[PDB]
Paper text:
Therefore, we resolved a crystal structure of A. aeolicus TsaD–TsaB in complex with ADP and Fe2+ and a crystal structure of A. aeolicus TsaD–TsaB in complex with Fe2+. In both crystals, the asymmetrical unit contains a single TsaD and TsaB. α2 and α3 from TsaD and α1 and α2 from TsaB interact to form a typical “helical bundle” interacting interface of TsaDB dimer, which conforms to those of E. coli and T. maritima TsaDB dimers. Two TsaDB dimers from symmetrical units further interact and form a TsaD2B2 tetramer. Crystal structures of A. aeolicus and T. maritima TsaD2B2 tetramer exhibit that two β3s of TsaB form two antiparallel β-strands that mainly support the dimerization of TsaDB. The dimerization interface also involves ionic bonds and hydrogen bonds between α3 and α6 (in A. aeolicus TsaD2B2) and ionic bonds between α1s (in T. maritima TsaD2B2). Our structures captured an apo-form of TsaDB and an ADP-bound form of TsaDB, which are perfectly superimposed with an RMSD value of 0.18 Å over 4017 atoms. In our crystal structure of A. aeolicus TsaDB, the helical hairpin α1–α2 (Ser31–Glu50) of TsaD simultaneously contacts the connecting loop of α6 and α7 of TsaD and the C-terminal tail of TsaB, and adopts a conformation that prevents anticodon stem loop of tRNA from docking into the t6A-catalytic site of TsaD. Structural juxtaposition of A. aeolicus TsaB, T. maritima TsaB, and E. coli TsaB exhibit that A. aeolicus TsaB adopts a conserved fold of the N-subdomain and varied fold of the C-subdomain. A. aeolicus TsaB is composed of more long-range unstructured regions (with well-defined electron densities) between β7 and α5. In t6A-catalytic center of A. aeolicus TsaD, we identified an oxidized state of Cys10 (CSO10), which is in range of van der Waals force contact of the TC-moiety of TC-AMP (about 5 Å).
The universal N6-threonylcarbamoyladenosine (t6A) at position 37 of tRNAs is one of the core post-transcriptional modifications that are needed for promoting translational fidelity. In bacteria, TsaC uses L-threonine, bicarbonate, and ATP to generate an intermediate threonylcarbamoyladenylate (TC-AMP), of which the TC moiety is transferred to N6 atom of tRNA A37 to generate t6A by TsaD with the support of TsaB and TsaE. TsaD and TsaB form a TsaDB dimer to which tRNA and TsaE are competitively bound. In this study, we reconstituted tRNA t6A biosynthesis using TsaC, TsaD, TsaB, and TsaE from Aquifex aeolicus and determined crystal structures of apo-form and ADP-bound form of TsaD2B2 tetramer.
Residue numbers in the entry:
A (entry chain A), D (entry chain A): 1 to 219, 226 to 335
B (entry chain B), C (entry chain B): 1 to 195
The structure:
């Protein structure tokens, strides 16, 4: 079977066609980074305008590249929640327009659920497993017992990792995207200055990162700062992940979200899996950032279980992953 | 020529069918439901199917921006995939053109906390402005929904003015001279304020 | 106050719901189906139930007499059995009162082979007349459906003018001063010609 | 069970409530004779106006006299056809308004079917039987094999009996209603002049009456004329009825319609049943003219067989009885 997937939850317009026998049939994305860059962040209204403008041209490219007919699609997958509600409604409108037009079922997907299943595109993972989701406004640990069955283990008490990278780069004056810039300054760092790891109490699976912008101000080459910040963040992520495996007894770890593309993060987690002997799944970088293929995969999982949405299904800015799975599976 | 014309500018959502140069169908509903709760379920309830139409029309406002983006996206998707023409239309222009009061005509509509208005003379017109209390010369034109808001020297209030009906008649005229319609990729709500 | 307002004057059958002094619902359909094929099945399709309303309004024309008799009989039956007020309204009066052209106003509508019209001045009005070609002083007012028929010195044609919406707003105003409405046993279509 | 019945097929507005255990619960009629009298006949448009005006006051009287609540009605019976279409739609509109309002089934009745079943109100009749229907525009013989199963045997090739009475009275100058006036002049007739009986061929079950206004002009007291006309008409009706019993072998005869109230007709048919030994059923005079009780009875018969009409059922000026029975039973 095959699905057209729609993702407009934040600042990327993503459409994809996925076939569970033939694989990727089409995949198109357009980022809005350039337009938000001057504002130092994602501007909600402007993002909504961009989705509205870009979604039809992207679709036209997707149809010309894939050569697929919409009559041959078995169901429309789309991100219902969470995200910017002004952007979410654009993709939902587009998905529901096609579904009604072509008389195809609608299958909703939670965005973080999409990130979990982005690794299944390359390799299926046995249940149960742990998921560290590190992207956007999220730095969460989940125990995934089955599709639709996600137990929340811990999350950030202040800044997510992505927001920490942005706040650090802006702190020492740098481009807005923050991430790439620090990963490149950090590659040039010589000395490793010590920084304090916030929570770090025995068995605590929550995260705190804003207590680093304080010790950072108590300071030297900007390269050593980027290098030292990046090392402390990745170490916090790993230790919390290790504690979660010991607390649960589960030795399969999925690491997903945009920060999972960080080349230093991948080194440290791969090394730890080699030293500790646990299974690690990180997606190809093209799948770490928002895309609709991961939405398509989770949509397949939900459709195959017989779950479709009614025509009047409405997006919401923030249904928790655990609750969404119970509602929709 | 059978046109499906849609208006999602306000909480009074409405759509019309235009055939033989006239309104043959109009459905108008004032609802507190969210735009995506109503669409496309309301079409299924009224047996309205996009493949049955030769062309589409849609309001680009002024109106509430999220509900405009939603309606425009429905219609662009249908028009593009079916290879059918699409015509955008503007609410304040229709209000001025269809109201036989003397010039100058000041159509206005309220969206959230802003009162948007536009000034029409016989042979020129202004940009869409934001009302700040100014004394205005001429005849205000609005809807009964906004009867508590006074612009101009006199005011006329339409008991009802379903933009999708007037927009569909306009689109019918438009397609006689421009059968290809407007560029589907370029249809966007009117934005008055910056992001 | 929730009013169900019905218009069966023409082949564009339409009904409205009036609440909080405004149209909250309007359904308008131009159909070649017979009036009793459409009623009451169209109400069932739109989940319109007479027990849900505080009051009823109905057009008494001018319009096609059989379809007027049918609509008036539906509404009188509901209003009488439920003990709810009912208000009749007149199409040509609404067309004159709601169109802001100067006096004299000459609203007109065509029914079969007759063009019925009425003359409105600021403080008086004529009987409903049958047009015979006479030159008339003032502003003709009609519907786009009848655009090929010219009365008066100038003509204004409404793209659309759903009488049930205007009649329902009028009934809402009427019931503020006369909460008991009009005598249900006396509601009859307007007859211009003899039997 | 019980029904509210609606009859507006010609120039009488008739509403009734009938209960198949308790009998007549209400019965109200208003004739339009006075209003049509100046025109020498029923004017269709004027009749439609009168139904519209009179149906609500009649209903109000019916509800006050019967004391029944509409919630206690099991179904609405109404005349769908035949008749004046401008009058038919008024009663149908009224019936469908109540049915939709009160969520009650609709059960259509053919007007002549109502006339057949007007005798069942007083006495059930075994099938098969013959029906002579003599009213309005009809002078027909039918073989009724069951409810809904009516075989047309013969009808008038020109004037019906009612129209003949009207044309005769107008011919010699008299009031429009024609019937009552001739039945009263005829009671005063001394001499019986011979008149020619039209069809009267062996085994022919059709009727012709207009060939009498010719021999009438070849003429004496107006009382002897009324008397002679009335005798010839009734004799034609009886002989045709007798031939129908011999051709079919069926010796039960129902005589219905307005002309069945004629006191001379009743004498001659009752006498013939006494002399020939066939069963004769003629209704009480109050049931010979249009009423809604007979509509209620036939509506009971059709409802009990599971037949209801859809909400969009539409009246028609003239569906033949035989075809109506097949369609609706
Ligand atoms: Fe994401
Ligand atoms: Fe009869």
């Amino acid at each position: 079977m095959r699905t057209l997937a729609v993702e407009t939850s934040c600042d990327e317009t993503a459409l994809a066609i996925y076939d569970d026998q033939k694989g990727v049939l089409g995949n198109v994305i357009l980022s809005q980074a350039v337009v938000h860059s001057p504002f130092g962040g994602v501007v909600p209204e402007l993002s909504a305008r961009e989705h509205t403008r870009n979604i039809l041209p992207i679709f036209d490219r997707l149809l010309k590249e894939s050569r697929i007919n919409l009559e041959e699609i078995d169901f429309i997958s789309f991100t219902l929640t969470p995200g910017l509600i002004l952007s979410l409604v654009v993709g939902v409108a587009f998905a529901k327009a096609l579904a009604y037009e072509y008389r195809k079922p609608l299958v909703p997907v939670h965005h973080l659920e999409g990130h979990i299943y982005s690794v299944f595109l390359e390799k299926k993972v046995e249940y149960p497993f742990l998921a560290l989701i590190i992207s956007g406004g999220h730095t969460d640990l989940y125990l995934v017992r089955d599709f639709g069955r996600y137990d929340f283990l811990g999350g950030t008490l202040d800044d997510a990792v992505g927001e920490a990278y942005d706040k650090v780069a802006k702190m020492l004056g740098l481009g807005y995207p923050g991430g790439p810039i620090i990963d490149r300054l950090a590659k040039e760092g010589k000395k490793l200055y010590p920084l304090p790891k916030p929570l770090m109490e025995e068995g605590n699976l929550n995260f705190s990162f804003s207590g680093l912008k304080t010790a950072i101000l108590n300071l030297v080459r900007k390269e050593d700062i980027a290098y030292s910040f990046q090392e402390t963040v990745v170490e916090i992520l790993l230790e919390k992940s290790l504690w979660a495996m010991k607390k649960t007894g589960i030795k399969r770890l999925v690491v997903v979200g945009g920060v999972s593309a960080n080349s230093r993060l991948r080194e440290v987690f791969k090394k730890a899996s080699q030293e500790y002997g646990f299974e690690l799944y990180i997606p190809h970088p093209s799948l770490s950032t928002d895309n609709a293929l991961m939405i398509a995969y989770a949509g397949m999982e939900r459709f195959k279980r017989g779950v479709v949405a009614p025509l009047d299904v409405n997006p919401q800015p923030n249904i928790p992953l655990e609750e969404f799975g119970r509602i929709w599976t | 020529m059978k046109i499906l014309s849609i208006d999602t500018s306000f909480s009074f959502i409405n759509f019309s069918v235009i055939e033989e140069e006239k309104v043959t169908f109009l459905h108008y509903l004032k609802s507190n439901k969210k735009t995506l709760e109503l669409l496309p379920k309301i079409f299924e309830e009224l047996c309205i199917r996009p493949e049955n139409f030769d062309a589409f029309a849609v309001s680009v406002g002024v109106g509430y921006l999220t509900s405009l983006r939603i309606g425009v996206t429905f219609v662009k998707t249908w028009a593009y995939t079916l290879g059918k023409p699409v015509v955008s239309y503007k609410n304040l222009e229709l209000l001025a053109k269809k109201t036989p009061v003397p010039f100058p005509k000041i159509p206005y509509l309220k969206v959230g906390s802003n009162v948007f208005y536009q000034i029409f003379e016989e042979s020129s017109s202004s940009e869409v402005k934001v009302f700040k209390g100014e004394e205005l010369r001429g005849y205000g034109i609005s809807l009964k929904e906004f009867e508590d808001i006074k612009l101009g020297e006199k005011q006329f209030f339409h008991d009802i003015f379903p933009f999708s009906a007037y927009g569909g008649i306009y689109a019918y005229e438009f397609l006689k001279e421009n059968p290809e319609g407007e560029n589907v990729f370029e249809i966007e709500p009117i934005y008055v304020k910056p992001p």
